[PDB]
Design a protein around this ligand. Structure first.
Ligand code: CYT
Ligand code: CYT
Ligand code: CYT
Ligand code: CL
Ligand code: MG
Ligand code: ZN
Ligand code: ZN
Ligand code: ZN
Lengths: 148, 153, 158
């Protein structure tokens, strides 16, 4: 059986008067993510991880972020792949993410047509180090397993 | 069969006044990590990720009276992964530290992790990188670990 | 069905007077990457991921930072030897995915060429090799164009 892995990376700046949307979840915060779309850093990293696993290139080559994640899933199936699992990490000094995670995971599992038990979202601070630890941006990392 | 991957990340500040412990190994150095075992946390996180059990923060709170050191948490993690129905297939990882030299300590760390995970030794790998004097890591202000894990149900 | 995964990281400083070589492609640019070898950040990260998947240590173990035979070393040749030691360990490579993070130059026009180089060195079809390119959204030393980073994941099978 023809397994493939992919890995994704994303980061966006924290700016004033933007809403903070991570994993499809709007979170109350003084700042939000700057990007050309809704800047959903978690969903972007997963998207890239999925594109990588199917050897379809990346987010820049192909293109709200949930519609984009859905399209990615469609193009992955187009290529003949099925998604086995997604895992990920959000790196954010603030605000607290713990309470929003199950929701993010539910958003992701819906968009990808996966059962909840095949999707995971983890959260880390940056221990006050670098631009992340200063709350100047937020990073996400993702890993995806697919099979042909 | 029913394979899953997981990935882990971790970082801790590196300052005078503490012992340096990485992958269960104490390392002579003029600094230490605020036990703070980056390598073992990233790997634990990777294992929960693969199992889709959340993360180390949900399982072992900076609160709970039940918790101990990073190898104990790794064992408990492994046991919880087993109960969800997953056997661990392999682990790989990278420590990014500008200093001190990690090469001599690598087989020791791999030995701890394989013991803790109940794996054949040839299923655990640990790599080491500098950050080429770039950023907080390259200035020695902290140390990062990265981990990946394959599991099967 | 004895599958293994690996992951890899690399960074190098971007400096005046050096060739810019990434994924084995020489990119026209006024700066290049600094290292002992040709400092190909992408191939190094992929080499790490392969060594890691096979549990063979890492690129420092196999091709020391200090052995003068690796001065100006072609990193494609290092990747090929890596693939060779992975197969000799009994693994076949199934796929590689990877990411480059760089403020500049534009990497999109060279990405296919990099994928081609990697697929040849690993003896894979193009459709099992993927290369992605990111900016760091202007954050940190990567945003300041001080270095270029790469990440890789590889799946192999015994
Ligand atoms: N920002 C956060 C980092 C880690 N854990 C959280 O719950 N929130
Ligand atoms: N800190 C280290 C960086 C790179 N190699 C080592 O062996 N140790
Ligand atoms: N340096 C680059 C970053 C992102 N995309 C590119 O095409 N190039
Ligand atoms: Cl940038
Ligand atoms: Mg990083
Ligand atoms: Zn993004
Ligand atoms: Zn930690
Ligand atoms: Zn390198």
């Amino acid at each position: 059986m023809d397994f493939r892995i992919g890995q994704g990376y994303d980061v966006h700046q924290l700016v004033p008067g933007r809403p903070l949307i991570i994993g499809g979840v709007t979170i109350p915060y003084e700042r939000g993510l700057l990007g050309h779309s809704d800047a959903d850093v978690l969903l972007h990293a997963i998207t890239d991880a999925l594109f990588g696993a199917a050897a379809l290139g990346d987010i820049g080559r192909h293109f709200d972020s949930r519609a984009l994640l859905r399209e990615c899933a469609s193009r992955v199936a187009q290529a003949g792949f099925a998604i086995r699992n997604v895992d990920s990490t959000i790196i954010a000094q603030a605000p607290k993410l713990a309470p929003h995670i199950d929701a993010m995971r539910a958003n992701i599992a819906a968009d990808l047509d996966l059962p909840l038990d095949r999707v995971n979202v983890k959260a880390k601070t940056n221990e006050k180090l670098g631009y992340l630890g200063r709350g100047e941006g937020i990073e996400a990392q993702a890993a995806a397993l697919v099979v042909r």
